[PDB]
Design a protein around this nucleic acid. Structure first.
Lengths: 104, 85, 149, 133, 42, 153
RNA sequence: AUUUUGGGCAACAGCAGGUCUGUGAUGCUCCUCAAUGUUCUGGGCGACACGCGCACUACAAUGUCAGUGAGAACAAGAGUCCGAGCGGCACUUCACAAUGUCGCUCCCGCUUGAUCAAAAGAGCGGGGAAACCACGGAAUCACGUAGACCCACUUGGGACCGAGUAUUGCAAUUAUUGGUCGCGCAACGAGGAAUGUCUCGUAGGCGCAGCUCAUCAAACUGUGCCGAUUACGUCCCUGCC
């Protein structure tokens, strides 16, 4: 067919939510003409925050660090666009950015 | 030194006679000392105080391109010499 | 087969290829220059007066290897660290005029080519000549083995 | 009438100053100061330059014309405002300076006294420690 | 330089953690890591 | 190194062009001499005249001296560039100068008193005795301990 | 191969600590505008006899200089919002100015190819949205090899600084920073009585991310590159159960 490399890219505030996302859509889309070369996942980006705590005035001027790693999953499909759009009818949660792109 | 300080609590070291110069004795001596040791190093030239291990070493190289001493490592810098045969 | 630029020590070879541009009188300095700071990092600068050849040798060394190496790359291969003063011990600055000269000159020397009008990559001829040079220098050493095998 | 200042600011005397624009007059000066004007446009002085100019008018043989207060700190001294008298704010004071010619071409920042003098000094009034309570 | 930040939680120049388009006081930041998703790394 | 045996090329220590020139030196800083302030090796001017390690300062040839004396005072006559030129806009010539010797001293007095004379914190800070920054200025002055000390009583 | 690794978490009381410098948590307690509100302006906290506390650097061949080395960590970056820049439109308008609109480019953040310059610096066209895709197939610091210094302040060292150019910022004038070339022999030859930390690819050195950030850290918080005594006990000392 005239495939579309569909890239459905899924970046998520945790790995957790998105894999669930990823999988189910793909399962849904697949079945059957949706044809996918397995999901590759780009580097987990990390956000660091160290803070000066305490308003010691006096007492230890010691400081504390919170982090948010952000997880990227990509699957590419050589698939039908309308079918893609047919399956694309999922309202999906937050914490899981899912982008879909049609390059080749 | 010109420096007012620049020297510690215990450390003490005396002077050498090695120099930039050009000297009849040095040159001539060098010719007679560069054969002399069985091993010849730039450092021993320095140690016989006439010319330091630096340019004396050049003295050795420029006596050893005259073969007077045998350049050992198969390259430069930390080459060394033995007296020639 | 043999030893090309991929196989040869510039320690003999750039020191000779420097001379290939010297000895032959092919390119030398540009009009704007011939004094040479090390680069923005230092006064004391090229004891070797042949720096620009050496440079060319080295820009050339770059250009066959990293085909398509832009202006900004040449700044980086330039390298160095700086002891500023009672201050940090941190890395140094690459003077671009001359960088740009080197780029202008090896392409005029036709050893460099401005790949895709940009990042330089070698002339064919350059590298055969380099390999040729490599062999000539290689064999007669002031080290150990084989001018007598 | 009045006297003289034998002076040369970049090879120029006050007349040679006078046949420049404050632009070209600054060309003589180093990169920031020349930049400063470049970066600028007009003067930040419209009224100020008139208060100067008027007072520049007022001059008599002895004595003086009055002083223009401003909080300024970057004026280039040009003959056009010369012989005027300037109140320079610093919080504490609008410090007063006549600009004769042997000041000309210099920047105001070169005459703005921005500080109090500690330098292990002494009390002048009735001070004792630091003002830290 | 200390006068143009004006903490969007707090109008503050002081006390505000300057980090990645945020403009919260240090306390406010300490309060917020959960809804955002920052968990201790060290 | 050479096998030269020479004593008249082992040379020393001569004061020329109102400078000092020591023996030895890779050659440069003998040429660097006389301060007050930059007097005028340029490194480059001298290096450009055709002087080097191949003579050191120690070789000390007269010929050389003449050549230096010649190159230095019209540096950019020798094309030895003007973009560096320790002085570049005077203000009485309003110009350029490869400044030399005691005329730099002269230049120092005149310019420093006026530069200092029209006053300002910044001005006084370099002037009276300070490093022209360091925020916390007292700490600097370390073991020179006495910036000068002042009282008007 | 040991409570395996570094953390994170972590009891219970306790400490008018500190916490008015977050707090749109606040007692009680003040001014409220001829206020100490608020803006604005301008200043200051950054002022040098000195006493310190950290840091940083040098004093140097174990080095410095000139050059040469096919060394990657770890990890950044393109906001929104219908007179910013640009543009179109609108109308005013003898011409200007004007205003207004719309649109773009969005008040356009990283930035690449590269020309012309001593030099830093000036730039068409490009490119990249956190992008493993452009700034990332190069390019991380002390390596290792060829050359000045025949080890003496050599100038070790640069405090110190002078014109000079570029950039930040409304503003630097309590030099914003760079740049440049001269330029230094300041102290400083490794530091007393004292004294600080520390027992594994790590000490430690060595360097680099990352942000404070208009503009600026020796800080901050990481990254790396390189790379080790004996201690492994003892419980003395000095201290905790």
């Amino acid at each position: 067919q005239e495939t579309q490399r569909v890239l459905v890219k899924m970046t998520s505030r945790n790995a957790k939510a998105v894999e669930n996302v990823m999988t189910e859509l793909l399962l849904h889309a697949r079945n059957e003409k949706v044809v996918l070369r397995g999901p590759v996942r780009l580097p987990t980006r990390t956000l660091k925050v160290t803070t000066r705590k305490t308003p010691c005035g006096n007492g230890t001027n010691t400081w504390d660090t919170y982090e948010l790693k952000i997880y990227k999953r990509l699957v590419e499909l050589r698939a039908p666009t309308e079918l893609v759009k047919k399956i694309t009818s999922f309202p999906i949660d937050a914490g899981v950015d899912v982008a879909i792109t049609i390059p080749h | 030194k010109k420096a007012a300080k620049k020297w510690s609590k215990g450390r003490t070291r005396e002077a050498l006679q090695n120099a930039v110069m050009f000297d009849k004795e040095t040159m001539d001596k060098l010719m007679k000392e560069v054969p002399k040791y069985k091993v010849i190093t730039p450092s021993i030239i320095s140690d016989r105080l006439k010319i330091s291990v630096a340019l004396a070493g050049k003295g050795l190289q420029h006596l050893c391109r005259q073969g007077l001493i045998r350049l050992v490592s198969c390259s430069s810098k930390f080459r060394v010499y033995t007296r020639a045969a | 087969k043999g030893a090309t630029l991929r196989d040869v020590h510039p320690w003999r070879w750039v020191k000779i290829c420097s001379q290939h541009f010297k000895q032959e009188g092919k390119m030398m300095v540009p009009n704007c220059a011939e004094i040479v700071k090390t680069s923005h990092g230092r006064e004391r600068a090229p004891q070797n007066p042949d720096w620009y050849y050496i440079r060319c040798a080295a820009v050339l060394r770059a250009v066959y290897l990293r085909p398509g190496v832009g202006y900004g790359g040449l700044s980086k291969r330039f390298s160095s660290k700086k002891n500023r003063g009672s201050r940090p011990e941190i890395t140094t600055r690459a003077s671009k005029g001359l960088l740009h000269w080197c780029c202008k000159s090896l392409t005029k020397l036709e050893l460099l080519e401005k790949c895709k009008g940009a990042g330089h990559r070698v002339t064919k001829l350059g590298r055969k000549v380099a390999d040729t040079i490599a062999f000539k220098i290689a064999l007669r050493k002031m080290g150990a083995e084989t001018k007598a095998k | 009438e009045r006297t003289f200042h034998k002076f040369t600011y970049r090879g120029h005397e006050i007349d040679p100053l006078l046949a420049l624009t404050e632009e070209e007059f600054k060309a003589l000066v180093h990169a920031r100061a020349r930049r400063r004007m470049n970066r600028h446009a007009d003067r930040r002085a419209p009224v100020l330059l008139k208060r100067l100019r008027e007072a520049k008018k007022n001059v008599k043989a002895g004595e003086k014309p009055k002083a223009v207060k401003t909080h300024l700190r970057d004026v280039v001294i040009t003959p056009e405002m010369v012989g005027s008298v300037v109140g320079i704010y610093n919080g504490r004071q609008f410090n007063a300076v006549e600009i004769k010619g042997e000041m000309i071409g210099h920047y105001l920042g070169e005459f703005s006294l921005t500080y109090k003098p500690v330098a292990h000094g002494r009390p002048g009034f009735g001070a004792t420690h630091s003002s830290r309570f | 330089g200390k006068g143009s930040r004006h903490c969007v939680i707090c109008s503050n120049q002081k006390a505000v953690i300057r980090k990645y388009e945020l403009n919260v006081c240090r306390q406010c930041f300490r309060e917020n890591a959960a809804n955002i998703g920052f968990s201790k790394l060290r | 190194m050479s096998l030269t045996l020479q004593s008249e090329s082992f040379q020393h220590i001569v004061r020329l062009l109102n400078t000092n020139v020591e023996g030895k030196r890779k050659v440069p800083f003998a040429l660097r001499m006389v301060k007050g302030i930059g007097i005028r090796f340029a490194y480059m001017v001298c290096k450009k005249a055709g002087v080097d390690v191949e003579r050191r300062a120690g070789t000390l040839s007269p010929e050389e001296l003449e050549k230096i004396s010649e190159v230095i005072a019209d540096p950019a006559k020798f094309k030895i560039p003007e973009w560096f030129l320790n002085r570049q806009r005077d203000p009485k010539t309003g110009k350029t100068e490869h400044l030399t010797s005691s005329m730099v001293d002269t230049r120092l007095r005149e310019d420093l008193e006026r530069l200092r004379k029209i006053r300002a914190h910044r001005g006084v800070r370099h002037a009276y005795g300070l490093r022209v920054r360091g925020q916390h200025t007292c700490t600097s002055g370390r073991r020179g301990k006495t910036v000068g000390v002042s009282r008007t009583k």
